[PDB]
Amino acid sequence: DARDIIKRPVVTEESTSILDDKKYTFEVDTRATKTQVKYAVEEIFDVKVAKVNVMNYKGKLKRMGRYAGYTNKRRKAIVTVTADSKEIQF
Amino acid sequence: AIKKYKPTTNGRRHMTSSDFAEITTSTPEKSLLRPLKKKAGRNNQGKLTVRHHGGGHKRQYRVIDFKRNKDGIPGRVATIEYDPNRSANIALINYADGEKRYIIAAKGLEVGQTIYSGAEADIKVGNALELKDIPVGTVIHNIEMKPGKGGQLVRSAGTSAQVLGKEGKYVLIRLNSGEVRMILATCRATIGQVGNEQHELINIGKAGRSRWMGKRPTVRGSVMNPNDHPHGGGEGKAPIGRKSPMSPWGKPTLGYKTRKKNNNSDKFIVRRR
Amino acid sequence: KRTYQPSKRKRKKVHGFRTRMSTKNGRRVLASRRRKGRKVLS
RNA sequence: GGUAUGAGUAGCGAAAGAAGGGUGAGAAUCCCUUCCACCGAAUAUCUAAGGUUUCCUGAGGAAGGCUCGUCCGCUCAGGGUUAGUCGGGACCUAAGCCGAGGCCGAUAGGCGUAGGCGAUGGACAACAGGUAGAGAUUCCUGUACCAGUGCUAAUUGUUUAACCGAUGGGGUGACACAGAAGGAUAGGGAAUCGCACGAAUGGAAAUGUGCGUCCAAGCAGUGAGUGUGAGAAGUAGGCAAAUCCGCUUCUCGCGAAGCAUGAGCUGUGAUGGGGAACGGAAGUUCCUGAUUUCACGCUGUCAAGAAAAGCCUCUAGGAAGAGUAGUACUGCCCGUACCGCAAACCGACACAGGUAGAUGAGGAGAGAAUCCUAAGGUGAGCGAGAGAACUCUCGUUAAGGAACUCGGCAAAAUGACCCCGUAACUUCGGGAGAAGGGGUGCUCUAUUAGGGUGCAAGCCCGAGAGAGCCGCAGUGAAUAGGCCCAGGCGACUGUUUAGCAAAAACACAGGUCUCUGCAAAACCGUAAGGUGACGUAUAGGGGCUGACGCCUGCCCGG
Ligand SMILES: [Mg+2]
Ligand SMILES: [Mg+2]
Ligand SMILES: [Mg+2]
Ligand SMILES: [Mg+2]
Ligand SMILES: [Mg+2]
Ligand SMILES: [Mg+2]
Ligand SMILES: [Mg+2]
Ligand SMILES: [Mg+2]
Ligand SMILES: [Mg+2]
Ligand SMILES: [Mg+2]
Ligand SMILES: [Mg+2]
Ligand SMILES: [Mg+2]
Ligand SMILES: [Mg+2]
Ligand SMILES: [Mg+2]
Ligand SMILES: [Mg+2]
Ligand SMILES: [Mg+2]
Ligand SMILES: [Mg+2]
Ligand SMILES: [Mg+2]
Ligand SMILES: [Mg+2]
Ligand SMILES: [Mg+2]
Ligand SMILES: [Mg+2]
Ligand SMILES: [Mg+2]
Ligand SMILES: [Mg+2]
Ligand SMILES: [Mg+2]
Ligand SMILES: [Mg+2]
Ligand SMILES: [Mg+2]
Ligand SMILES: [Mg+2]
Ligand SMILES: [Mg+2]
Ligand SMILES: [Mg+2]
Ligand SMILES: [Mg+2]
Ligand SMILES: [Mg+2]
Ligand SMILES: [Mg+2]
Ligand SMILES: [Mg+2]
Ligand SMILES: [Mg+2]
Ligand SMILES: [Mg+2]
Ligand SMILES: [Mg+2]
Ligand SMILES: [Mg+2]
Ligand SMILES: [Mg+2]
Ligand SMILES: [Mg+2]
């Protein structure tokens, strides 16, 4: 399925700053290839994808009173839609 | 010939070396090279089982032909080459059929000469015949012990063996050691002394040059502690405080014969040395 | 120069899980550490 | 476990700070400014390891920080790492490891063949700008390349063989070390040109001062050079085959062509980009010149210097689709933050220690030495006074000069370059920088004399002599051997008791004895299997001795 591959959009000062450059930032499945992401985004948003850049974020160490542990590892995809494609909303 | 170095340094003072005059090329036959890794005297257990080996110069193995299988095909000596794996020089033989092999370079084997192997072969130097076909008094080398196995018995630089006689299906050979034994008559040997006979005269000249040849230093037994060697211990220098000098492993090591007493080959040894 | 000169690979090759599993005595170690209830084997 | 005592004591961990301004409840300690000082073959810039969020922003000041703290590598929130081309994997093998069957073995297991895995090596396509709180050969702009894929179009095959082509053959791949001379370019200098200024305190509109003084991969040309005798017959070999390799013969033979390679250069790339001044000028010439590159190319040496894939070619095979051109698409996974000679790594510490590699500017210089500096980095997480004893680290010292002391221990002295001069002894190499003497600055006659580059202009190196000049002193600072005579021991360079012994000890080349005929002896292992050795008596193991010279006597009774 495609909506298992795309988890949720990423809304930060950085991710919002490139919504005008037709570059949309998503949190995707940690097993998903950037090819799987390119076809997932095309199936969900009816856009034409130019390129998909992807980066693995390792979990960040957090303490909450004696109890220490790691946040979840993330896979972040930045999908650049072509100049003729429709835009994703956010 | 031997070249005596001038004593410019204390390291070169008494050092001697081959002039390598016999050597005709410096570029070995690429097709006949195999890789060769140093073992530094270590076993398949990785344990050091022979002392004093390790860390020489890197070497390639040249696949030598000790068998001499190519009967009745003329072989032209192409070059006399240096071989780092053995005291003797080697000779690249261009066979008329276009096959190239290395043989041990016999004393007086020059480029241009045409060597022959088999039953029709003449008694000229680098020729290889079965011992049944070699006259008495002849000087041979690269003697095989089992038919078809390839020469193993006199291959080192300057070594020679002499055919003494024929007893049944065996031949009396007098080996380089002066031993006389019975080699099987279907075993082939090559004609003539092995060549590079100046080799024994060489003076290594400095510690370092032994290290280049892959030899680590030998520590005498008598400067070890009692727990390391039977000659260990004693306040100051000590004599051998034993009835006999001992190997590191016990066992007498002066005049104590180590040939196995009930040995299968004994029936073939005619005179010892 | 101190005794511990770290190496990610040497650590795992000497003391790692797969190396422990590759021998009967290494499996004894894993069994022992499980029995004691260690959070970390290997 | 708690809490004393010692005690407000030792210590606060190498180092230069100052003032002004700001912030704030509060400031030696945070921020800014200016001056000052320190590193600069590093105390700078990269990169690998290792660490693993320490990175950025905002907030905080309990604890941590040897003081303080508004600050922080600390606490709390949010964020931040973008790749067909960079590094790794979807490629390759080395050591080594594993290992179907197999061999061996009370059990457990040990070994090992095919076959795998395994970089520290091999192969392999991207550059310059821009941008910025935190990434950038990754994002954006421009311009490429590699591998594919379709889609159009001709072109040529469509069963006698276009085309592909081995899991097989062959070639290449493919390698040490040292040395010397070159080409080139990085880099470094002058001038030139551009822009700005024209001056504090006596002088200078000028040989005046300051700042600048150009750019990719790719593509197309060229090109110092470096290698290399082409061609045709034949065919006991390359497990089959081969038009390929190898071998042989014959013709042509040459030093030149061709053919390989080849740093660099020119053009384009660029109407683009950058650039001294709210924005835009100049880009030239010369000298010098590599530790880079051509290139282990050449020459030489002996100690004789990976493999495999890849690439090329050969046939065995397979074959109707193949290539060429255009066009538009496709290109996965892992890493990417930050520190990285360090406060983030190894040292329990924000620890005078340790930590591989790339780059590493100028003056004087042989230099990466030295001193002072450039770019860049830093002022080191306690301070203010005081200027006692004593201790440590330093400077100087009358007269004397080893009287000190176990002992000149320590310190002093010597030190660079140039010229003269140089003993015994000797294995004829040495000893030797022996020892011992003398010199060294500046100015002028000096576009030097003469050299190097050079079509020339010019620009760089410039001696000796003479004349002068100044100081107590001219390698004016820093950095650069103390020397000699006679013995013992060990020939020598090496090695050693990590952390009280560096030696006369070990080793060593050489010597001699002895074992060992190859399934060698010897060694490891219960064995198999190994090392010895892919060696074979001129070799291998063991014992003793220890270069070299002269020698090595008598004794076989134990
Ligand atoms: Mg990535
Ligand atoms: Mg030995
Ligand atoms: Mg001792
Ligand atoms: Mg004993
Ligand atoms: Mg005594
Ligand atoms: Mg004794
Ligand atoms: Mg530790
Ligand atoms: Mg007190
Ligand atoms: Mg006190
Ligand atoms: Mg104090
Ligand atoms: Mg301090
Ligand atoms: Mg220095
Ligand atoms: Mg920070
Ligand atoms: Mg505090
Ligand atoms: Mg703060
Ligand atoms: Mg790109
Ligand atoms: Mg192997
Ligand atoms: Mg293998
Ligand atoms: Mg691999
Ligand atoms: Mg950064
Ligand atoms: Mg080779
Ligand atoms: Mg980075
Ligand atoms: Mg430190
Ligand atoms: Mg070091
Ligand atoms: Mg500066
Ligand atoms: Mg005095
Ligand atoms: Mg005086
Ligand atoms: Mg006295
Ligand atoms: Mg005296
Ligand atoms: Mg006295
Ligand atoms: Mg005395
Ligand atoms: Mg002294
Ligand atoms: Mg001086
Ligand atoms: Mg000595
Ligand atoms: Mg010690
Ligand atoms: Mg000592
Ligand atoms: Mg064996
Ligand atoms: Mg001795
Ligand atoms: Mg010896």
Curated annotation (Swiss-Prot), chain A:
GO MF term (any one): structural constituent of ribosome
Gene3D superfamilies attached to this UniProt entry: 3.30.70.330
Name of protein: Large ribosomal subunit protein uL23
Subunit structure: Part of the 50S ribosomal subunit. Contacts protein L29, and trigger factor when it is bound to the ribosome.
Listed GO CC annotations: cytosolic large ribosomal subunit
Record GO biological process: translation
Keywords: Ribonucleoprotein, Ribosomal protein, RNA-binding, rRNA-binding
Organism of origin: Listeria monocytogenes serovar 1/2a (strain ATCC BAA-679 / EGD-e)
Keyword Nucleotidyltransferase: no
Function: One of the early assembly proteins it binds 23S rRNA. One of the proteins that surrounds the polypeptide exit tunnel on the outside of the ribosome. Forms the main docking site for trigger factor binding to the ribosome.
Statement: the UniProt record of this protein carries the keyword RNA-binding: yes
Pfam family, one: Ribosomal_L23
Family: Belongs to the universal ribosomal protein uL23 family.
Swiss-Prot record, chain B:
Keyword terms, alphabetized: Ribonucleoprotein, Ribosomal protein, RNA-binding, rRNA-binding
GO cellular component: large ribosomal subunit
PROSITE patterns assigned: RIBOSOMAL_L2
Pfam families: Ribosomal_L2, Ribosomal_L2_C
InterPro entries from the UniProt entry: NA-bd_OB-fold, Rib_uL2_dom2, Ribosomal_uL2, Ribosomal_uL2_bac/org-type, Ribosomal_uL2_C, Ribosomal_uL2_CS, Ribosomal_uL2_dom3, Ribosomal_uL2_RNA-bd_dom
Matches recorded under SMART domains: Ribosomal_L2, Ribosomal_L2_C
Record-linked Gene3D superfamilies: 2.30.30.30, Nucleic acid-binding proteins, Ribosomal protein L2, domain 3
Gene Ontology MF term list: RNA binding; rRNA binding; structural constituent of ribosome; transferase activity
Keyword rRNA-binding: yes
BP terms from Gene Ontology: cytoplasmic translation
Region feature (Disordered): 23-54, 220-273
Function: One of the primary rRNA binding proteins. Required for association of the 30S and 50S subunits to form the 70S ribosome, for tRNA binding and peptide bond formation. It has been suggested to have peptidyltransferase activity; this is somewhat controversial. Makes several contacts with the 16S rRNA in the 70S ribosome.
HAMAP family: Ribosomal_uL2_B
Subunit details: Part of the 50S ribosomal subunit. Forms a bridge to the 30S subunit in the 70S ribosome.
Name under which the protein is recorded: Large ribosomal subunit protein uL2
Curated annotation (Swiss-Prot), chain C:
GO biological process, alphabetically ordered: translation
Gene Ontology CC entries for this record: ribonucleoprotein complex; ribosome
Keywords: Ribonucleoprotein, Ribosomal protein
GO terms for MF: structural constituent of ribosome
A Pfam short name: Ribosomal_L34
Compositionally biased residues, Basic residues: 1-18, 25-42
PROSITE patterns: RIBOSOMAL_L34
Sequence segments annotated as region (Disordered): 1-42
PANTHER family from the UniProt entry: LARGE RIBOSOMAL SUBUNIT PROTEIN BL34M, MITOCHONDRIAL RIBOSOMAL PROTEIN 34 FAMILY MEMBER
Homology family: Belongs to the bacterial ribosomal protein bL34 family.
Protein name as it appears in the record: Large ribosomal subunit protein bL34
Lineage summary: Bacteria, Bacillati, Bacillota, Bacilli, Bacillales
